[PDB]
Design a binder for this molecule. Structure first.
Ligand SMILES: *[C@@H]1O[C@H](CO)[C@@H](O)[C@H](O)[C@H]1NC(C)=O
Ligand SMILES: OC[C@H]1O[C@H](O)[C@@H](O)[C@@H](O)[C@@H]1O
Ligand SMILES: [Zn+2]
Length: 1014
């Protein structure tokens, strides 16, 4: 395996280094506003060296943005595709590329067989070419890599089945900045080329000056270069026609033949297009070829890419005609006039790349190597697109919940073959497709209109229900004696219990386990562990009595803690935010121990009085002017006091100290170690009263954040043997620190209410000497080094925090792991901050046509890990990556893939079993089975199961780290007949594996395997 820690890759362009050197001056470059006046040597091209130009027609179709997916399909996309089919069929030299398979699948399935065949023919003959072939064109900032892969697989699996093609070139013209997670996944999914567009204007200028817009993009840790993927970055401000023919949009706009008037479009630069005729073609061609030759100066080969399209283009027949006929006249003239030395034609993206690489192999070009990312994007001036790292955070959190439920549903149901009547494949496809749709660059990004966000939410809610149905049917089958198992595929044998979604204070959604002498003495519950190692985790359930004890299915008592159910209320009468306790519902908490990729059953039983193995938390309400807080049968009376500093310790874990406002002030790791200052604070950013306003996309703060005025908040302290917590009702946030014996969990119930033009940030202040360095993750896959740059404005120093961030010095590191993607930064040495929500009254001029005023309460979850790192083997100071410790990685897994909890619905479970998966291998902690998916329906003689295995890289810090078993996924199911390594989408077999044994992957590698079973 490659060493991903100790060898700093030698690349031509390393983006962090480039950022350190660049001046980012925003000067008027002339007609190319953010570039310079491009000059070329007319004698560069001649009879023996011509400029090859590929004009590539396209239509950018958003699966939801200002209309819903279905609205756009009905109004626009179905017409675009129907007219594409017609106009391509009738014009054999015309070409068209298509990206969004969600739309294409919708269209194709509605076609009559005659048209289906015509469509297959124009694909087979290369007129219509699929680019990327994902369900969507995903966001790259907020998306988890698992969901990027999911949506890619959904689209490509559809394309293989119905169109018999698998794209090897990717087209990403629209996401707001670009992540190296994309080439990572694409290169492991058969791709050979990719195209990107939305990079900072200063980066485009810098790379253009060096002809480094085409590069071999490798991962930041990759010393050898095996991850490299050829990447083309477009040079100009937009992907529209005015910014794709050449540097001067006043000229290029004249070659968008949709802008002459009858289509309701015009040219902002005030020179309209004119129909190409015999009397103007020479003059028109002269202007156009001049633009092309200028664009060609920015690249290294004699092959030029000219995209020809815009949003929802090629909709009307008249539009197809006007673009095609005018370009055909230009091509006929240009190609016939030797003095131009140009050969121009309609082409596809693959044709462009094939020609570039032909030129490369002819020796006319060498391409530079590059590592790094392309965040944070700015399209002009100080307009940095860091707002969408946080916008619509409820749905950002929902994404992560559904991510896990899809994984769990696919894994749980993969163990068996299911009859068609069970509707398992149907529900899983629904769930995969809704989650995939939300990866769209207007979905998870929070940049869609309110009614579109509602549509995405409804879709995801349906997906969650689908997942629950599949999971609970699977649990019942896996844990019932086979000769007793008698499924009703419509019945709910179990109800999922999720303690953190939608969450306490967000939705009263969870079922109370109702026990009683005169109703039901006991209840079975089941935990699922999707991770491939034995796992313990505290789990909680609501119960109707405090006198409940827990046993495993061997009837061994399990230590439990009962706590009250506390609900926070904004008291409109007293004008205070304070907790109310239930007098009929209680929380029972215990440690579940669950096999790798397995299930464990426990029983909750009521008694008349305090059970031997159940303890009761104490509760202390700190406030002036307290009132009583009765708790029914709960055996310990609530205590009251004036606000005061408090300290808590659970188990042998850290000791945490809190301010009188209920906010963390210090962490002490061991009994005789220092009390390390770690201070939580909440602050607010505002919006500018003059100039550009923040909106869904842009973060344009009116200076550094100002502290939230806290008043004298009510603090609730719960102290238990298994779990303790401090909760405080702050303005807009119920902030909770929970301790279970390791790194604390933080939960914020964020309700920004009617606070217009406000962004609420949570900041951590420490004494870590981090300087200007911090680390943030990319797509939950890798951690990249960031450097705060005071030469850039505040909003430029904000980065996506899709799963975590950290700061460190020689001795100490603080890592904050997240259960949802949000924006964040380190704006001063020793600080971390992460945005919670934003409510913005104005539009930010990027097309949305609304602010963000549809906020709703959201429960954000985190883990906070303070560690000594003086003994850790870390990368050198020049390495662009960072890596988590074991503790931080496990903390991230606790947030993203917690145990699933199932409550048996009926009174008695006949044939119940205690465990599933006790014989599954318990793999090394850095390995995950990211995907387990049965690939075949029940009628297939040879069953196939696909696995995606990911190995992260964890820091070596002197812990022996012992006793784990080799995980061979190909032997997880019996009767293996073949094991194959495949692309990550499962669509191509790459290796036939000796002995049917799937080897474990290297650090930072992801591999896919398919086992076949007789
Ligand atoms: C699918 O495409 C391959 C070439 O990539 C071709 O050989 C094969 O016949 C096609 N399969 C069918 C029948 O669709
Ligand atoms: O300005 C951002 C905006 O650009 C275009 O209009 C669309 O493709 C949207 O997907 C995107 O949100
Ligand atoms: Zn778009």
């Amino acid at each position: 395996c490659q060493d991903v820690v100790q060898d700093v890759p030698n690349v031509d362009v390393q983006m962090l280094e480039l950022y350190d050197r660049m001046s980012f001056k925003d000067i008027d470059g002339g007609v190319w506003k953010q570039g310079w006046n491009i000059k070329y040597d007319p004698l560069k091209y001649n009879a023996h060296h011509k400029l090859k130009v590929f004009v590539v027609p396209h239509s950018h179709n958003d699966p939801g943005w200002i209309q819903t997916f279905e609205e756009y399909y009905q109004h626009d996309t179905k017409h675009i595709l129907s007219n594409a089919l017609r106009h391509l069929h009738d014009n054999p030299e015309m070409k068209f590329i298509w990206a969004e398979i969600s739309y294409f699948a919708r269209f194709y399935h509605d076609l009559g067989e005659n048209k289906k065949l015509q469509m297959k023919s124009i694909v087979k003959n290369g007129q219509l070419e699929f680019v990327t072939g994902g369900w969507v064109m995903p966001d790259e900032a907020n998306s988890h890599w698992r969901n990027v892969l999911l949506q890619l697989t959904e689209g490509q699996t559809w394309l293989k089945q119905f169109m018999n093609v698998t794209p090897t070139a990717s087209w990403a013209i629209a996401p707001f900045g670009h992540s190296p997670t994309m080439p990572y996944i694409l290169q492991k999914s058969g791709f050979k080329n990719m195209l990107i567009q939305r990079t900072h204007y200063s980066v485009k200028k810098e790379l253009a000056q060096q002809r480094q817009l085409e590069f071999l993009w490798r991962q930041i840790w990759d010393n050898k270069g095996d991850t490299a993927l050829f990447t083309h970055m477009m040079p100009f401000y937009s992907y529209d026609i005015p910014h794709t023919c050449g540097p001067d949009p006043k000229v290029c706009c004249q070659f968008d033949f949709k802008r002459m008037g009858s289509f309701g479009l015009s040219c902002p630069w005030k020179v309209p297009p004119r129909t190409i005729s015999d009397q103007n073609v020479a003059a028109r061609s002269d202007l156009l070829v001049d633009q092309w030759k200028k664009k060609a100066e920015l690249y290294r080969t004699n092959v030029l890419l000219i995209p020809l399209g815009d949003d929802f283009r090629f909709k009307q027949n008249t539009e197809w005609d006007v673009q095609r006929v005018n370009y055909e006249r230009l091509f006929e003239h240009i190609n016939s006039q030797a003095h131009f030395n140009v050969q121009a034609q309609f082409g596809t993206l693959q044709e462009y790349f094939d020609a570039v690489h032909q030129a490369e192999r002819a020796g006319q070009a060498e391409f530079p190597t590059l590592s790094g990312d392309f965040f944070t994007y700015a399209d002009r001036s100080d307009n940095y697109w860091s707002g969408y790292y946080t916008s619509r955070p409820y749905h950002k959190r929902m994404d992560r919940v559904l991510m896990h439920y899809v994984r769990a549903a696919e894994m749980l149901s993969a163990w068996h073959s299911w009859d068609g009547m069970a509707r398992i494949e149907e529900r899983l496809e629904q769930a995969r497709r809704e989650l995939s749709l939300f990866q769209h660059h207007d979905g998870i990004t929070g940049t869609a209109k309110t009614h579109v966000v509602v549509d995405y939410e409804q879709r995801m809610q349906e997906a969650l229900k689908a997942c629950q149905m599949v999971m609970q049917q699977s649990v019942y089958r896996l844990l019932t004696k086979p000769s007793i198992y008698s499924p009703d595929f419509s019945f709910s044998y179990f109800t999922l219990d999720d303690s953190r979604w939608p969450g306490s204070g967000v939705e009263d959604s969870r079922t109370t386990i109702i026990l009683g002498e005169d109703i039901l003495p006991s209840k079975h519950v089941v935990m699922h562990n999707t991770l491939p190692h034995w796992r313990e985790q505290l789990v909680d359930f609501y119960v109707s009595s405090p006198f409940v004890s827990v046993t495993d299915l061997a009837n061994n008592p399990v230590e439990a803690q009962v706590s009250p159910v506390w609900s926070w209320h904004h008291d409109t009468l007293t004008k205070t935010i304070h907790p109310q306790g239930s007098t009929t519902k209680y929380r029972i908490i215990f440690k579940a121990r669950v096999p790798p990729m397995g299930l464990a059953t426990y029983v909750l039983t009521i008694s008349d009085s305090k059970p031997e193995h159940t303890s009761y938390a104490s509760n202390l309400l700190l406030r002036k002017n307290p009132t009583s807080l009765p708790l029914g049968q709960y055996p310990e009376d609530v205590k009251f006091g004036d606000p005061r500093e408090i300290s808590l310790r659970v188990g042998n874990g850290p000791t945490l100290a809190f301010s009188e406002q209920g906010l963390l002030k210090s962490i002490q790791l061991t009994q005789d170690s220092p009390h390390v200052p770690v201070h939580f604070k909440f602050l607010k950013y505002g919006v500018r009263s003059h100039g550009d306003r923040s909106g869904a996309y842009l973060f344009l703060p009116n200076g550094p954040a100002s502290p939230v005025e806290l008043g004298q908040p009510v603090v609730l302290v719960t102290k238990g043997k298994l779990e303790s917590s401090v909760s405080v009702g702050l303005p807009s946030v119920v902030h909770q620190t929970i301790m279970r014996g390791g790194a604390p969990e933080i939960r914020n119930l964020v309700d920004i209410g009617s606070l217009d033009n406000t962004e609420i940030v949570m900041r951590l202040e420490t004494h870590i000497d981090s300087g200007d360095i911090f680390y943030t993750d990319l797509n939950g896959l890798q951690f990249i080094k960031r450097r705060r740059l005071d030469k850039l404005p505040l909003q430029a120093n904000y980065y996506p925090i899709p799963s975590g961030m950290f700061i460190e010095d020689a001795n100490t590191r603080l890592t904050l792991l997240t259960g949802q993607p949000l924006g964040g930064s380190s704006l001063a040495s020793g600080e971390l901050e992460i945005m919670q929500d934003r409510r913005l009254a104005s539009d930010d001029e990027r097309g949305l046509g609304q602010g963000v005023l549809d906020n709703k309460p959201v429960l954000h979850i985190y883990r906070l890990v303070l560690e000594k790192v003086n003994n850790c083997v870390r990368p050198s100071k020049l390495h662009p990556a960072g890596y988590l410790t074991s503790a931080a990685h496990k903390a991230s897994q606790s947030l993203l893939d917690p145990l699933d909890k199932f409550i048996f619905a009926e009174n008695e479970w006949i044939g119940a079993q205690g465990q599933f998966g006790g014989d599954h291998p318990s793999a090394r902690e850095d390995l995950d089975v990211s995907v387990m998916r049965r690939l075949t329906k029940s009628s297939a003689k040879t069953q196939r199961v696909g696995y995606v295995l990911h190995r992260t890289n964890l820091m070596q810090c002197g812990t022996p780290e012992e006793h784990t078993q080799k995980l061979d996924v190909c032997h997880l199911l019996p009767n293996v007949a073949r094991c194959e390594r495949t692309t990550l989408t499962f669509l191509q077999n790459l290796e036939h594996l000796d002995g049917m044994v799937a080897p474990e992957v290297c650090p930072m590698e992801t591999a896919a395997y398919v086992s076949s079973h007789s």
